[PDB]
């Protein structure tokens, strides 16, 4: 029962006690509660936090009640200690985490390059129970999108032809016309889906998909049935956990959202950004994106020194490439940046790298893992946090918060979107309703969030759309931390600085982030990259 930095009643009395002034009904409130807190040795760390929560709230009443009170400045300082005490609770009182590596891939067949990445973990970590999530009901979501978007491109290009050299028809006008069609196609499928399921509530997703492709886009069903069969085998053989078995999630409120982004929006990224944390909440372990690889040993390459010209992320990227050239664990893991090196140092790798026998000497394993029940550790790329590496304890207080954050965001989204979408109109007129309504219900807190939310329809068919990040992605995790440290719930605007977020960083040595497929994930839909794609599409038909 560590007392921590947090001050004792008598100390706080000494911190404030202004001369010739009695104690109020509302000031003693803090003292009686703070005294209680220090007597909670036997109680859980989470129960200690909720007592701080109440203390924090009690103090900000006492400063708001009397804004004259000279105490304030001291009580303003007392708030700081509470934060530190929360951090001290986090770090000091740790619990063993459940040894469960989680992966997720839904919407289509699992790719082999993904499985190769998974196996790397699975090999070195024999003790961990790996669970690569999938969805039996939805193997044809990805192919549904693929068929539509491509069939929407073909239509859009032909609408131009007679205006191909006309400089009004630029990349912007193209995607805008494409999305107009994509929305119409995507919506049509929805109205079919929400009439087929309304008719026969024992039809799965795929059954509606395959039939939709058959009638409209002229696809033979038997070819799809071999695909789903080939998929189900491939995942089942590779430690496949179905989401339909995980009914704890389906019974939860976040499921509606999972399906929404899966079936209605064909946003697999979003769906997977939900499932991952909802998994950690109810199972406990480490979630990884499939593009991730395990940590290289600190020692392995401690003798070699870095070049001056090349950057640090380039160095870490080659450290990985070196492995896959000589030990050859993965088929043709590009040796691009390794062949952009000096031959003398290339041989330095070849020599020292081949001077180890098997895989245990290469990659460091996880083994025993400790983390607080208040925290959910998260990875850091160059540009902030990222939800590709999530350590968590079963039913963590943060893990909860993060889900409640996601739930509430989608609440605000749907409680503005669903009105607009229902009264069916053209894409453009829908978007101009959806946004208008958002801006009405948008204060000076959620302002910075709401901006991004307004682009929600455009997610995946437009450049520069960070909406999905503000829904199921990093922002939410940031908010949850703010919820923690501000002793509140449902913070939407983030005012936490990088340094504050570091308190929840998964140690860098556990995850080798600088993989090939992550640089393929990091393509980043820049406005410029879009233009070249338009030129490429324009090349195809002619």
Sole binder of a second copy in the list 47, 220, 328, 464 (CB under 8 A): 464
Which of these ranges, 151-159, 302-310, 369-377, 393-401, lies near a second copy under the rule CB under 8 A?
A: 302-310
Tokens of 368: 């025993």
Strand 95-96 with 370-371, pairing: antiparallel
Burial classification of residue 337, based on how many CB atoms lie within 10 Å of its CB (0-12 exposed, 13-18 middle, 19 or more buried):
middle
To Mn ion, the closest distance from the beta carbon of 105 in angstroms equals 12
Q: What is the DSSP track for 410-439? A: HHHHHHHHHHHHHS---HHHHHHHHHHHHH
Residues 6+ apart with CB under 8 A from 201: none
The answer to whether 274 is a known ligand-binding residue is: yes
The answer to whether 21 is a known ligand-binding residue is: no
Closest-CB residue for ligand UDP?
521
Q: Under the rule (CB under 6 A), what is the footprint of ligand UDP?
A: 104-108, 142, 268-269, 272, 289-291, 388, 518, 521
CB 70 within 8 A of CB 18: yes
The answer to whether 289 is a known ligand-binding residue is: yes
The answer to whether 290 is a known ligand-binding residue is: yes
- Residue 232 contact partner, candidates a second copy, Mn ion, ligand UDP, none, CB within 5 to 8 A by sort of partner: none
Count of Cβ atoms closer than 10 Å to residue 373 Cβ? 24
Sole binder of a second copy in the list 203, 448, 490, 537 (CB under 8 A): 448
Q: Is residue 460 near a second copy by the rule CB under 8 A?
A: no
To a second copy, the closest distance from the beta carbon of 95 in angstroms equals 31
Smaller CB distance to ligand UDP: residue 85 or 135? 135
Kindly report each contact of residues 485-488 with a partner whose C-beta sits within 8 Å and lies 24 or more positions away, as own/partner: 485/83, 485/86, 485/87, 487/52, 487/53, 487/56, 487/57, 487/82, 487/86
Smaller CB distance to a second copy: residue 297 or 437? 437
The answer to whether 276 is a known ligand-binding residue is: yes
The answer to whether 518 is a known ligand-binding residue is: yes
Smaller CB distance to ligand UDP: residue 324 or 390? 390
Residues paired with residue 293 on neighbouring β-strands, in sequence order: 512
Q: Is residue 375 near Mn ion by the rule CB under 5 A?
A: no
Closest-CB residue for Mn ion?
521
- Residue 50 contact partner, candidates Mn ion, a second copy, ligand UDP, none, CB within 5 to 8 A by sort of partner: none
Backbone phi, then psi, for 429, in 5-degree steps?
-70, -30
To ligand UDP, the closest distance from the beta carbon of 144 in angstroms equals 12
Order of all β-strands in the sheet with 384-392: 240-242, 131-134, 101-104, 285-288, 384-392, 376-381
- Residue 347 contact partner, candidates Mn ion, a second copy, ligand UDP, none, CB within 5 to 8 A by sort of partner: none
Q: Count interface residues toward Mn ion (CB under 5 A).
A: 3
The answer to whether 291 is a known ligand-binding residue is: yes
Smaller CB distance to Mn ion: residue 27 or 117? 117
Could you give the CA distance from residue 132 to residue 104 in angstroms, rounded to a whole number?
A: 5
Task: Restricting to residues 520-539, name those near a second copy by CB under 8 A.
Answer: 526-528, 531
Sole binder of Mn ion in the list 261, 273, 291, 407 (CB under 5 A): 291
The answer to whether 514 is a known ligand-binding residue is: no
Which of these ranges, 179-187, 277-285, 287-295, 321-329, lies near Mn ion under the rule CB under 5 A?
A: 287-295
Could you give the CA distance from residue 492 to residue 439 in angstroms, rounded to a whole number?
A: 15
Residues paired with residue 132 on neighbouring β-strands, in sequence order: 103, 240
Smaller CB distance to Mn ion: residue 85 or 518? 518
Q: Where do the DSSP E strands lie in 29-147?
A: 95-96, 101-104, 131-134
To a second copy, the closest distance from the beta carbon of 159 in angstroms equals 16
**Helix pair 45-65, 72-92: axis angle to 10 deg:** 170
The answer to whether 521 is a known ligand-binding residue is: yes
Q: Is residue 423 near a second copy by the rule CB under 8 A?
A: yes
Count of Cβ atoms closer than 10 Å to residue 112 Cβ? 12
- Residue 294 contact partner, candidates ligand UDP, a second copy, Mn ion, none, CB within 5 to 8 A by sort of partner: none
* 3-class DSSP state of 247: helix
Burial classification of residue 89, based on how many CB atoms lie within 10 Å of its CB (0-12 exposed, 13-18 middle, 19 or more buried):
buried
For residues 391, 397, 400, 401, the Cα torsion angle rounded to the nearest 10 degrees is -100
* 3-class DSSP state of 363: strand
Task: Restricting to residues 491-530, name those near Mn ion by CB under 5 A.
Answer: 518, 521
Q: Is residue 297 near a second copy by the rule CB under 8 A?
A: no
Sole binder of a second copy in the list 2, 167, 299, 540 (CB under 8 A): 167
Which residues lie near a second copy (CB under 8 A)? 22-26, 61, 65-66, 68, 163, 165-168, 172, 191, 194-195, 198, 256, 260, 307-310, 340-342, 414-415, 418-419, 422-423, 435, 439, 442, 447-448, 450-452, 454-455, 464, 526-528, 531
Q: Which residues are annotated as a binding site for Mn(2+)?
A: 291, 518
Query: Which chain residues interact with Mn ion by CB under 5 A?
Result: 291, 518, 521
């Amino acid at each position: 029962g560590s007392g921590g930095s947090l001050v004792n009643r008598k100390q706080l009395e000494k911190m404030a006690n202004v001369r010739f002034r009695t104690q109020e009904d509302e000031y003693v409130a803090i003292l009686d509660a703070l005294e209680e807190y220090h007597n909670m040795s036997e109680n859980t760390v989470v129960e200690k936090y909720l007592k701080l929560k109440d203390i924090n709230s009690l103090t900000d009443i006492c400063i708001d009640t009397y804004k004259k009170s000279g105490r304030n400045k001291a009580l303003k300082k007392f708030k700081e200690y509470l934060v530190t005490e929360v951090l001290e609770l986090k770090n000091n009182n740790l619990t063993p985490v459940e040894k469960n590596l989680h992966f997720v891939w839904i919407g289509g067949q699992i790719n082999d390059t993904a499985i190769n990445y998974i196996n790397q973990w699975k090999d070195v970590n024999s003790d961990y129970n790996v669970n690569v999530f999938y969805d039996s009901n939805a193997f044809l979501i990805n192919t549904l999108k693929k068929t539509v978007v491509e069939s929407a491109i073909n239509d859009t290009l032909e609408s131009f032809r007679e205006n191909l050299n006309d400089p009004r028809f630029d990349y912007n006008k193209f995607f805008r016309k494409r999305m107009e069609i994509i929305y119409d196609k995507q919506k049509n499928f929805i109205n079919y889906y929400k009439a087929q399921r309304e008719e026969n509530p024992e039809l799965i997703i795929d059954d509606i998909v395959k039939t939709y492709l058959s009638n409209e886009y002229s696809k033979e069903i038997d070819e799809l049935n071999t695909y789903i069969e080939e998929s189900l085998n491939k995942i089942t053989q590779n430690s496949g956990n179905d989401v339909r078995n995980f009914g704890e999630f389906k019974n939860g409120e976040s499921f509606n959202l999972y399906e929404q982004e899966l079936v209605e929006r064909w946003n697999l990224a979003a769906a997977s950004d939900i499932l991952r944390i909802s998994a950690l909440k109810e199972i406990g372990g480490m979630y990884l994106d499939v593009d991730m690889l395990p940590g290289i040993q600190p020692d392995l390459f401690e003798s070699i020194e870095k070049p001056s010209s090349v950057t640090v992320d380039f160095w870490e990227m080659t450290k990985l490439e070196a492995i896959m050239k000589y030990k050859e664990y993965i088929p043709e893991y590009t040796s691009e940046h390794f062949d952009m090196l000096d031959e003398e140092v290339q041989s330095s790798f070849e020599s020292v790298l081949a001077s180890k026998s098997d895989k245990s000497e290469i990659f460091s394993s996880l083994g025993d893992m400790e983390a607080s029940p208040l925290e959910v550790k998260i990875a850091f790329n160059s540009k902030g946090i990222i939800n590709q590496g999530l350590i968590s304890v079963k039913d963590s207080y943060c893990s909860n918060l993060i889900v409640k954050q996601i739930e509430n965001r989608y609440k605000i989204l749907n409680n503005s979107l669903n009105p607009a979408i229902s009264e069916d109109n053209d894409f453009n007129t829908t978007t101009n309703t959806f946004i208008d309504s958002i801006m009405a219900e948008a204060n000076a807190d959620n302002g910075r969030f709401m901006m991004e939310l307004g682009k929600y329809l455009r997610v995946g068919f437009f450049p520069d759309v960070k909406t999905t990040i503000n829904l199921s992605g990093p922002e939410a995790y940031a908010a949850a931390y703010q919820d923690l440290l501000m002793f509140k719930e449902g913070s939407m605007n983030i005012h936490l600085i990088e340094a504050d977020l570091r308190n929840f960083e998964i140690s860098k040595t556990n995850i080798s982030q600088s993989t090939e497929q992550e640089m393929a994930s990091l393509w980043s839909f820049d406005d410029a990259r879009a233009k070249a794609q338009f030129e490429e599409y324009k090349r195809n038909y002619f």
